[PDB]
Amino acid sequence: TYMGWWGSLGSPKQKYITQYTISPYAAKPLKGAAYNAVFNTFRRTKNQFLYVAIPFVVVWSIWTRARDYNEYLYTKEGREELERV
Amino acid sequence: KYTTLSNGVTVATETNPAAKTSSVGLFFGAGSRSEHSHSNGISALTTNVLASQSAKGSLLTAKNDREFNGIIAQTTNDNITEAGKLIASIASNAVDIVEKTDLTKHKQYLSAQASAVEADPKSKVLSHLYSSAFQGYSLALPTLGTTESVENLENQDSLRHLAKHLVNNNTVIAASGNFDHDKLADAIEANLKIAEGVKPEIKPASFLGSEVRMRDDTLPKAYISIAVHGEGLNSPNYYLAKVAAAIYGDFYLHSTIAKFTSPKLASIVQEYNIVESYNHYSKSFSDTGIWGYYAEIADKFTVDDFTHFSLKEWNRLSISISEAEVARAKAQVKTALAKELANSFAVTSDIAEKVLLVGHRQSLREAFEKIDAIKVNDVKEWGKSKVWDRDIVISGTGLIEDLLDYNRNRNEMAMM
Numbered sequence: 001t002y003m004g005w006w007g008s009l010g011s012p013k014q015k016y017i018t019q020y021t022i023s024p025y026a027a028k029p030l031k032g033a034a035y036n037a038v039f040n041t042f043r044r045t046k047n048q049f050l051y052v053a054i055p056f057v058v059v060w061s062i063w064t065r066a067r068d069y070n071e072y073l074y075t076k077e078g079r080e081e082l083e084r085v
Numbered sequence: 086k087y088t089t090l091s092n093g094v095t096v097a098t099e100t101n102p103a104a105k106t107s108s109v110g111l112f113f114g115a116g117s118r119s120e121h122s123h124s125n126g127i128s129a130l131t132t133n134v135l136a137s138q139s140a141k142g143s144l145l146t147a148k149n150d151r152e153f154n155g156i157i158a159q160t161t162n163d164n165i166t167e168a169g170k171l172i173a174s175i176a177s178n179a180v181d182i183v184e185k186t187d188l189t190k191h192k193q194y195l196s197a198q199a200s201a202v203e204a205d206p207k208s209k210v211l212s213h214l215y216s217s218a219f220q221g222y223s224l225a226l227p228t229l230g231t232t233e234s235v236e237n238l239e240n241q242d243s244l245r246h247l248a249k250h251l252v253n254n255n256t257v258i259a260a261s262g263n264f265d266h267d268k269l270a271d272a273i274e275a276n277l278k279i280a281e282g283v284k285p286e287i288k289p290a291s292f293l294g295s296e297v298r299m300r301d302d303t304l305p306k307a308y309i310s311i312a313v314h315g316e317g318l319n320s321p322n323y324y325l326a327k328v329a330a331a332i333y334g335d336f337y338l339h340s341t342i343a344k345f346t347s348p349k350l351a352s353i354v355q356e357y358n359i360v361e362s363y364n365h366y367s368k369s370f371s372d373t374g375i376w377g378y379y380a381e382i383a384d385k386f387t388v389d390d391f392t393h394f395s396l397k398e399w400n401r402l403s404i405s406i407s408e409a410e411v412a413r414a415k416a417q418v419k420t421a422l423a424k425e426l427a428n429s430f431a432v433t434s435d436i437a438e439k440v441l442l443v444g445h446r447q448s449l450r451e452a453f454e455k456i457d458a459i460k461v462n463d464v465k466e467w468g469k470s471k472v473w474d475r476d477i478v479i480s481g482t483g484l485i486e487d488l489l490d491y492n493r494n495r496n497e498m499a500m501m
Contacts, residue, residue: 005386006386006389006486006487006489007385007386007388007484007486007487008385008386008486009486011302011486013302013303014300014302015300015301015302015303016301017299017300018297018298018299019296019297019298019300020217020295020296020297021295021296021491022293022294022295022296023293023294023295023476023477023491023495024491024492024495025294025476025495026293026294026295026476
């Protein structure tokens with residue numbers, strides 16, 4: 001398999017890396033939650049916006065044209081065009 | 086026995102006619118704790134330079150401790166007075182000796198020692214544990230400095246260190262062996278000439294629960310160490326902390342007694358041979374300490390099991406330690422204290438350490454009386470105060486991939 005248990009997770013020989021951390025009780029919880037959740041969230045949204053906007057814009061433009069045409073067909077002035085279809 | 090000479094320096098000696106060999110040493114406090122990152126290791130380098138001088142038949146050695154430094158001239162009993170004069174000279178000419186010294190060889194030797202403590206897995210583990218526990222303060226610095234900072238030291242820095250720390254108010258002449266104290270005091274008085282100065286303020290330090298992981302997968306074992314804020318030499322719980330540590334004691338899997346050692350942790354850890362060896366310790370500095378254990382696990386798949394069981398046994402400290410365990414720990418601590426104070430070199434080192442860092446040294450009889458007074462309820466109160474649900478500091482070197490994150494070990498400290 002590609003993932004063992006804790007003793008051997010399949011990681012390559014790892015060496016020269018030092019990891020530091022502090023106790024949760026000694027660390028401030030939710031330090032910059034107020035500032036982070038605004039500024040960093042806006043940064044993430046800015047980075048990922050176009051990928052969700054361009055597809056959304058295309059699909060919603062297609063949906064809007066289809067919906068508007070459908071609304072137009074079922075009206076007194078759309079009767080003839082509905083009949084032709 | 087104490088005598089405050091002229092210049093205000095104090096000569097403290099513990100003379101005993103049964104001593105095999107005598108020793109006398111000048112210790113001027115200000116170990117690594119007095120240094121800062123840029124000039125770290127200067128105290129050890131200076132003490133090595135001083136102790137590298139001509140011995141005149143004695144045995145000069147450097148101390149290089151965390152909070153104090155000194156030069157010790159071990160020698161046979163009848164020669165002690167000569168050794169006295171020797172060290173006096175070595176310290177009356179300290180600035181001259183340092184000025185005339187080419188540090189290249191001494192810095193090479195000091196860097197070799199620094200690498201040595203960076204290779205011996207236990208030395209590395211405990212050095213990293215102390216560094217992370219007291220991170221942000223001078224106490225986190227190595228006793229012998231790092232291999233990067235040592236090469237950046239020069240004679241002038243050593244001279245500044247000596248001028249600041251090698252002063253009468255900050256120095257002590259410790260001695261032990263079989264000799265007349267008055268003779269040694271008189272011999273040193275005529276030869277000791279060190280600059281006046283106020284005792285340098287001892288830098289503060291506060292314990293910060295943390296974790297450091299130097300995971301090197303190429304090593305054959307997992308060398309971990311887990312501790313909590315202990316008791317410094319000042320605290321009245323000093324011997325109580327030693328008793329609490331001894332309740333769990335030492336262990337070596339391949340030792341013959343391994344299947345018979347009293348501590349419950351020892352019996353727990355042979356069932357699947359969780360750990361190869363471990364030892365509980367109460368390192369004590371001037372005002373703060375580290376109380377915990379060091380351990381070497383051979384089976385890389387059982388680091389978590391060992392940490393779990395050891396911290397459960399720590400939990401047992403505040404609840405279910407029985408009178409048998411407390412009595413055993415008291416006896417073992419008394420025997421260990423007596424053992425540490427057999428060699429005259431060790432007695433000299435202890436005298437210097439205590440006189441510099443606490444001002445008064447409790448005789449061994451007083452220590453025995455203080456340990457005997459400990460009741461099981463005292464040990465349990467200490468366990469509640471300092472162990473139960475308290476922050477831990479962790480260190481690991483190799484094959485510690487199984488050593489779970491900080492939260493798991495920390496939360497092991499308060500479950501029943």
